[PDB]
Amino acid sequence: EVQLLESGGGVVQPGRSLRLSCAASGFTFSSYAIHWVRQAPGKGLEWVALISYDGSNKYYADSVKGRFTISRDNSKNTLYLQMNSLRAEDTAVYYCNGHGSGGEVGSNWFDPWGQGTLVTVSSASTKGPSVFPLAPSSGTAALGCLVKDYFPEPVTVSWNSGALTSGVHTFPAVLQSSGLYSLSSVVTVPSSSLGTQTYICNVNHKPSNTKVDKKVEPKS
Amino acid sequence: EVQLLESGGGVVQPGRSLRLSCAASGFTFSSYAIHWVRQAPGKGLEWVALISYDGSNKYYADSVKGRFTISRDNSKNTLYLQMNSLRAEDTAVYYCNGHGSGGEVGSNWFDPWGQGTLVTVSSASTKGPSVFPLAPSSGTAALGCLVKDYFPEPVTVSWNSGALTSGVHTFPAVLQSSGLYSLSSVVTVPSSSLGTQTYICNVNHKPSNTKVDKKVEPKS
Amino acid sequence: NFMLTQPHSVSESPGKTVTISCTRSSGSIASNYVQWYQQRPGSSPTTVIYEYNQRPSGVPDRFSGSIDSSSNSASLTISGLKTEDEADYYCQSYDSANRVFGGGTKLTVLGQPKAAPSVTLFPPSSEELQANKATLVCLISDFYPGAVTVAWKADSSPVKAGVETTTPSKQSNNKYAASSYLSLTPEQWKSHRSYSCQVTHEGSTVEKTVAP
Amino acid sequence: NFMLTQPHSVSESPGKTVTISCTRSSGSIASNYVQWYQQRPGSSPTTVIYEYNQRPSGVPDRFSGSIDSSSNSASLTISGLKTEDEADYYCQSYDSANRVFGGGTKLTVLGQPKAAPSVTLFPPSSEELQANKATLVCLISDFYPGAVTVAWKADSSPVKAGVETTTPSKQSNNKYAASSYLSLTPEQWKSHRSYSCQVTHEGSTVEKTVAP
Amino acid sequence: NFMLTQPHSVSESPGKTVTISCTRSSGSIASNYVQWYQQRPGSSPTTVIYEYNQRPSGVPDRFSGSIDSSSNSASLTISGLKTEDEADYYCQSYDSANRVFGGGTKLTVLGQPKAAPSVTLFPPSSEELQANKATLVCLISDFYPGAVTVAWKADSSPVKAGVETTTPSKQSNNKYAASSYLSLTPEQWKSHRSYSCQVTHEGSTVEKTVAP
Amino acid sequence: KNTRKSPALIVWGIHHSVSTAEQTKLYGSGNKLVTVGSSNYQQSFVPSPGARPQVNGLSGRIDFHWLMLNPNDTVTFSFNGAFIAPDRASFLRGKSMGIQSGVQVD
């Protein structure tokens, strides 16, 4: 019955603003202090902000001071986080999390968390993937095909027109610091078929409608 | 009005001896204990010695025991540091520094320092600079001219007979562990003028009266 | 003011006991309370320990908290591990009013013998150097546990010019896979003798190099 | 008996607060008093802190002293930095009667954005090898702050056979410049694959190598 | 639970004083008593210190024990060293009932000036590569004291695929000699640029490399 | 400051917490101090956080101190935390007689 409801999450660009809200129900909201705690994807938790039970005191993280501004409405049982002047790193899941004694010192542990609201801050440029060759340096070897600088996910990879699937793997994408995606896909083969069959790479990123081939051939 | 006057500094050779003195005026010298604290050039402070208010106790640094001997004359208000059997590393600025409670425990902070007396311990050999070539390994590059194994400072460097001054720099000298100086001077140029103009180096160390040229030409 | 350091990863066989440390860089660990949080993938965190040793209602008796004032650390220990325990764990203490979280500790419970990764580096594509660029491709696959450190080196020296992905699992072998991309230019690529993809896995640091 | 370790350098923007640590290798930091000294270039040192926290008459309220018994350290902290504060700082404690000084901490207040150095190494001259000698020439220029570490490596390994200068300022760009000279012989110069001039600047360790 | 770390070796001239440290990784050094044991070559160990400072009947006044709660260490100190004191020393403390021994500290009393080792590496034999194998041969000789660290590197990276002998003395020059054998295969021997025999002696780390 | 012309009964308390952790959680870090002042009484109180014998579950204690403040006199509570403040002061009404017994009233 006790729950916290984060709302207001979405995708934005840098330099802009945002506002987040938490709906509290199931406990005496007016007595506990409330916290904002985020977590970037693949990263760990980071405490963002906190506000006291009566709003007298607001404490912000040193990495977020000036930009974010915390506030609360006890009559409405709502928490507000004003994330203006956003940056690229602020991209994270945002949990509202109650954390405080609440006037009692016995104080069985009371620390509720919400489900977290995703806040993605990417720059721009739905882009088409540029394909590059990946040659093996000459009893087994492997070679690949590079899918660089695209946006957004997902894509569909087919090696040699969906023919060579045995001993082939496609790895997940990375989020570059430039904000654009990129992923790879490699094929493993015995050292026998070197030069025998040319290896044309056939990708398909749907929104960019870009499908490019790339044959691998050993250098010299 | 309170001051400390270090005297007796100068240049010596290793194995020899030296004596330093500090003249105290402006406070009750007979009551405080006095310290010798030195600092090698480019290095940090190092406590050398200390002597009590009544000369009963003398405490020396472990790196200087046996050689140095501290003493004081309260009737003359003078401090004495006997630096016999000197080494090469003892080269440093030498401050006399009063540091002690002085019989009182309230004891507003009383820690005076002098201006420090330089003690240079170099070996010998006012020498002439030997010049060496410094070639670039082939859209910009740079090449140089080496001025090694000279004594003493300073020198006067002129590249291509005081002609090429744009994009040229001369860096300060180093004190080798052998006691002799050495400094460099480099010129930065675009990758264009490679082989075009030969680069003769023209130095002038005044006391050694040595002026040597050195043209740079790429190797193969 | 201070930071809480906990190991990047740890692993132990089921039924055996495991301990996770949390070392405070500045200030006594006894100055402020330490909470131990458990976060499962995708799920919201759940407190496993609070106030250094207190077991909230619901957490089994296996979870115990401890304080080592000597090493200024706090330890979360689980006896008789179970595969459900495989999650990330974060210690959190307090600066004066601000909360401070640990770096996280990926605890994987052994479900198979440990497998070293299969590193396959790639030289930078030629046409990329014809675009005046250089982006290396280091592919890491078939390793268990799913904790790996990927440091690039400019001939055994710290480089920070690359972007490397997190370590997700395999939809095929119940192992984990990852990749890495070191971005440079052909000038730096030719003004240095080589660059190393260093991959520390369970201490054993496999490496693969690339040279011009 | 013990030594006091403080960081080689630190920097922070004006108006911001900065802290400098002083860690005692053996023995409790509370056993003996700790004094904090300030030394400006060429000038004699002036005590900024005494008896761990006491501000002598004249020192502004920005200077504060603190003790961290947990990390066995002592910290000197300045709030609202000013360009006048740019000097070296030494912590000093006491062995039984002898005084012990810290390694020094070069505190530079930011007067511009940070600039990485311009390393230009030089292969040893041929006629020097014809004198049966070898002295490398590593030139470092255009870097701010003026704190730099120069370690030579015999293919990533500690070498102590060189002489390197301190880091003075520039009479041209208000930056700092330095040099280094690694001395060897052509036998060692050919019995090793290469030698590296490693230059750590603000953590970013630029490197330039030389090979026979 | 915890481990006791003491330095691998230490040396000092006769008549001078020497101290050996014993640092406890987890838990207060004052929680359990610390015993100091002396083991001479071939002989059974003899207690030199017990209960942190107590000198059993027979041990001369030179041996003293001390506790440093700050660094959580225990120190055994000998004043006025004598050549008889040249042995290995082990500190031992207690987990709840189990005893825990230190890693040992080889104390050599100087009987001559320090000599750096004479490293002579060897490329792997060809017919061994014709047996699909590779075992390097690093020979270390003419070094004093007899304490040496031998780490192999896959181009400056941790390798654990080798077997290296202890360091016995010389029947000729009263020095010590040792050897090392790194075992691999020609595939790994050609998929890596080189391998280094790194030999740290009294801090000075001599190195010799091998390349395909 | 006391208004009436009879002496006042003032009572305060110190919270010696179970540990420096709980004390920091409640009143912040740093040494805690409660000086109590009065023309005829002056004392300083420093809380000693420790894990006392566990009375009914709680190892922390709250002790009480008291003073009688004469008419037209001032009492000064300078403090830093760990202070159990009073809301009301007591003023003895008249005269009475106190006994101890377990027997029934009549």
Coordinates of N, CA and C in Angstrom, one line a residue, chain B residues 62-157:
Chain B
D62 N 69.5 12.3 11.2 CA 70.2 11.1 11.0 C 71.0 11.1 9.7
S63 N 70.6 12.0 8.7 CA 71.3 12.1 7.5 C 72.6 13.0 7.6
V64 N 72.8 13.6 8.8 CA 73.9 14.5 9.0 C 74.7 14.2 10.2
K65 N 74.4 13.2 11.0 CA 75.1 12.8 12.2 C 76.6 12.6 11.9
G66 N 77.4 13.0 12.9 CA 78.9 12.8 12.8 C 79.6 14.0 12.2
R67 N 79.1 14.5 11.1 CA 79.7 15.6 10.4 C 79.4 16.9 11.0
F68 N 78.1 17.3 11.1 CA 77.7 18.6 11.6 C 77.8 18.6 13.2
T69 N 78.0 19.7 13.7 CA 78.1 19.9 15.2 C 77.5 21.3 15.5
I70 N 76.5 21.3 16.3 CA 75.8 22.5 16.6 C 76.3 23.1 18.0
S71 N 76.2 24.4 18.1 CA 76.7 25.0 19.3 C 76.1 26.4 19.4
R72 N 76.2 27.1 20.5 CA 75.6 28.4 20.7 C 76.4 29.1 21.8
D73 N 76.4 30.5 21.7 CA 77.0 31.4 22.7 C 75.9 32.3 23.1
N74 N 75.3 32.1 24.3 CA 74.2 33.0 24.7 C 74.7 34.4 25.1
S75 N 75.9 34.5 25.6 CA 76.5 35.8 26.0 C 76.6 36.6 24.7
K76 N 76.9 36.0 23.6 CA 77.0 36.7 22.3 C 75.7 36.6 21.4
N77 N 74.7 35.8 21.9 CA 73.5 35.6 21.1 C 73.8 35.1 19.7
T78 N 74.6 34.0 19.6 CA 75.1 33.5 18.3 C 74.9 32.0 18.2
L79 N 74.5 31.5 17.1 CA 74.4 30.1 16.8 C 75.4 29.7 15.8
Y80 N 76.0 28.5 16.0 CA 77.1 28.0 15.2 C 76.8 26.6 14.7
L81 N 76.9 26.3 13.4 CA 76.8 25.0 12.8 C 78.1 24.6 12.1
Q82 N 78.7 23.6 12.6 CA 80.0 23.1 12.1 C 79.8 22.0 11.1
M83 N 79.9 22.3 9.8 CA 79.6 21.4 8.7 C 81.0 20.9 8.2
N84 N 81.7 20.1 9.0 CA 82.9 19.5 8.4 C 82.6 18.2 7.7
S85 N 83.6 17.8 6.9 CA 83.4 16.6 6.0 C 82.2 16.6 5.1
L86 N 82.1 17.8 4.4 CA 80.9 18.0 3.6 C 80.8 17.0 2.5
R87 N 79.6 16.9 1.9 CA 79.3 16.0 0.8 C 78.7 16.9 -0.3
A88 N 78.3 16.2 -1.4 CA 77.8 16.9 -2.6 C 76.3 17.3 -2.3
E89 N 75.6 16.5 -1.6 CA 74.1 16.7 -1.4 C 73.8 17.8 -0.4
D90 N 74.8 18.1 0.5 CA 74.6 19.1 1.5 C 74.3 20.5 0.9
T91 N 74.5 20.7 -0.4 CA 74.3 21.9 -1.1 C 72.8 22.3 -0.9
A92 N 72.6 23.5 -0.2 CA 71.2 23.9 0.1 C 71.3 25.3 0.7
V93 N 70.1 25.9 0.8 CA 69.9 27.1 1.5 C 69.8 26.7 3.0
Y94 N 70.4 27.5 3.9 CA 70.5 27.1 5.3 C 69.8 28.3 6.1
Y95 N 68.7 28.0 6.7 CA 68.0 28.9 7.6 C 68.2 28.5 9.1
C96 N 68.5 29.5 9.9 CA 68.3 29.4 11.3 C 66.9 29.7 11.7
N97 N 66.3 28.9 12.6 CA 64.9 29.0 12.8 C 64.6 28.7 14.3
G98 N 64.2 29.6 15.1 CA 63.9 29.4 16.5 C 62.5 28.7 16.6
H99 N 62.5 27.6 17.5 CA 61.4 26.7 17.6 C 61.4 26.1 18.9
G100 N 60.5 26.6 19.8 CA 60.5 26.1 21.2 C 59.4 26.8 22.0
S101 N 59.0 26.1 23.1 CA 58.0 26.6 23.9 C 58.5 27.9 24.7
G102 N 59.8 27.8 25.2 CA 60.4 28.9 25.9 C 59.9 29.1 27.3
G103 N 59.6 28.0 28.0 CA 59.2 28.0 29.4 C 57.7 28.3 29.6
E104 N 57.0 28.8 28.6 CA 55.6 29.1 28.8 C 54.8 28.1 28.0
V105 N 53.6 27.8 28.5 CA 52.7 26.8 27.9 C 51.5 27.4 27.2
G106 N 51.1 28.7 27.5 CA 50.1 29.4 26.7 C 50.7 29.6 25.3
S107 N 51.8 30.4 25.3 CA 52.8 30.3 24.2 C 52.1 30.6 22.8
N108 N 51.7 31.8 22.7 CA 51.4 32.3 21.3 C 52.5 31.9 20.4
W109 N 52.2 31.5 19.1 CA 53.1 30.9 18.2 C 54.3 31.8 17.9
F110 N 55.5 31.4 18.3 CA 56.7 32.1 18.1 C 57.7 31.2 17.4
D111 N 57.8 31.4 16.1 CA 58.7 30.6 15.2 C 59.3 31.5 14.1
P112 N 60.4 32.2 14.5 CA 61.1 33.1 13.5 C 62.0 32.3 12.6
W113 N 62.1 32.9 11.4 CA 63.0 32.3 10.4 C 63.9 33.5 9.8
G114 N 65.1 33.1 9.5 CA 66.0 34.1 8.8 C 65.7 34.0 7.3
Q115 N 66.6 34.7 6.5 CA 66.5 34.7 5.1 C 67.2 33.6 4.4
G116 N 68.0 32.8 5.1 CA 68.7 31.7 4.6 C 70.0 32.0 3.8
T117 N 71.1 31.2 4.1 CA 72.4 31.4 3.4 C 72.7 30.3 2.5
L118 N 73.0 30.6 1.3 CA 73.2 29.6 0.3 C 74.6 28.9 0.5
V119 N 74.6 27.6 0.4 CA 75.8 26.7 0.6 C 75.8 25.8 -0.7
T120 N 76.7 26.2 -1.6 CA 76.9 25.4 -2.8 C 78.1 24.6 -2.7
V121 N 78.0 23.3 -2.9 CA 79.2 22.4 -2.8 C 79.2 21.7 -4.2
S122 N 80.0 22.3 -5.1 CA 80.3 21.7 -6.4 C 81.8 21.3 -6.4
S123 N 82.2 20.4 -7.4 CA 83.5 19.8 -7.3 C 84.6 20.7 -7.8
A124 N 84.6 21.0 -9.1 CA 85.7 21.6 -9.8 C 85.4 22.0 -11.2
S125 N 86.4 22.3 -12.0 CA 86.3 22.2 -13.5 C 85.4 23.2 -14.1
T126 N 85.7 24.5 -14.1 CA 85.2 25.5 -15.0 C 85.5 24.9 -16.4
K127 N 84.5 24.6 -17.2 CA 84.6 23.8 -18.4 C 84.0 24.5 -19.6
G128 N 84.4 24.0 -20.8 CA 83.8 24.5 -22.0 C 82.7 23.6 -22.5
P129 N 81.6 24.2 -23.0 CA 80.5 23.4 -23.5 C 80.8 22.6 -24.7
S130 N 80.5 21.3 -24.7 CA 80.6 20.4 -25.9 C 79.2 20.4 -26.6
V131 N 79.2 20.6 -27.9 CA 77.9 20.7 -28.6 C 77.7 19.5 -29.4
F132 N 76.4 19.0 -29.4 CA 76.0 17.8 -30.1 C 74.8 18.0 -31.0
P133 N 74.6 17.2 -32.0 CA 73.5 17.4 -32.9 C 72.3 16.7 -32.4
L134 N 71.1 17.3 -32.7 CA 69.8 16.8 -32.4 C 68.9 16.9 -33.6
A135 N 68.7 15.8 -34.4 CA 68.1 15.6 -35.7 C 66.6 15.2 -35.5
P136 N 65.7 15.6 -36.3 CA 64.3 15.1 -36.3 C 64.1 13.8 -37.0
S137 N 63.2 13.0 -36.4 CA 62.9 11.7 -37.0 C 61.7 11.9 -38.0
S138 N 62.0 11.9 -39.3 CA 61.0 12.1 -40.3 C 60.1 10.9 -40.4
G139 N 51.9 18.3 -39.8 CA 52.7 19.0 -40.8 C 53.8 19.9 -40.3
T140 N 54.3 19.6 -39.1 CA 55.3 20.3 -38.4 C 56.3 19.4 -37.7
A141 N 57.5 19.9 -37.5 CA 58.6 19.1 -36.9 C 59.4 20.1 -36.1
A142 N 60.5 19.6 -35.5 CA 61.4 20.4 -34.7 C 62.8 19.7 -34.6
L143 N 63.8 20.5 -34.5 CA 65.2 20.0 -34.3 C 65.9 20.9 -33.3
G144 N 67.1 20.4 -32.8 CA 67.8 21.1 -31.8 C 69.3 21.1 -31.8
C145 N 69.9 21.4 -30.7 CA 71.3 21.6 -30.6 C 71.7 21.4 -29.1
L146 N 72.6 20.6 -28.8 CA 72.9 20.2 -27.4 C 74.2 20.9 -26.9
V147 N 74.0 21.5 -25.7 CA 75.1 22.2 -25.0 C 75.4 21.4 -23.7
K148 N 76.4 20.5 -23.7 CA 76.6 19.6 -22.6 C 77.9 19.8 -21.9
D149 N 77.9 19.5 -20.6 CA 79.1 19.5 -19.8 C 79.9 20.8 -19.8
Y150 N 79.3 21.8 -19.2 CA 80.0 23.1 -19.1 C 79.9 23.6 -17.6
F151 N 80.7 24.6 -17.3 CA 80.7 25.2 -16.0 C 81.5 26.5 -16.1
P152 N 81.1 27.6 -15.4 CA 79.8 27.7 -14.8 C 78.8 28.5 -15.6
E153 N 77.6 28.8 -15.0 CA 76.6 29.6 -15.7 C 77.1 31.1 -15.8
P154 N 76.5 31.9 -16.8 CA 75.6 31.5 -17.8 C 76.2 31.3 -19.1
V155 N 75.4 31.2 -20.2 CA 75.8 31.1 -21.6 C 75.0 32.0 -22.4
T156 N 75.4 32.1 -23.7 CA 74.6 32.9 -24.7 C 74.5 32.0 -26.0
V157 N 73.2 31.7 -26.3 CA 72.9 30.9 -27.4 C 72.4 31.7 -28.6

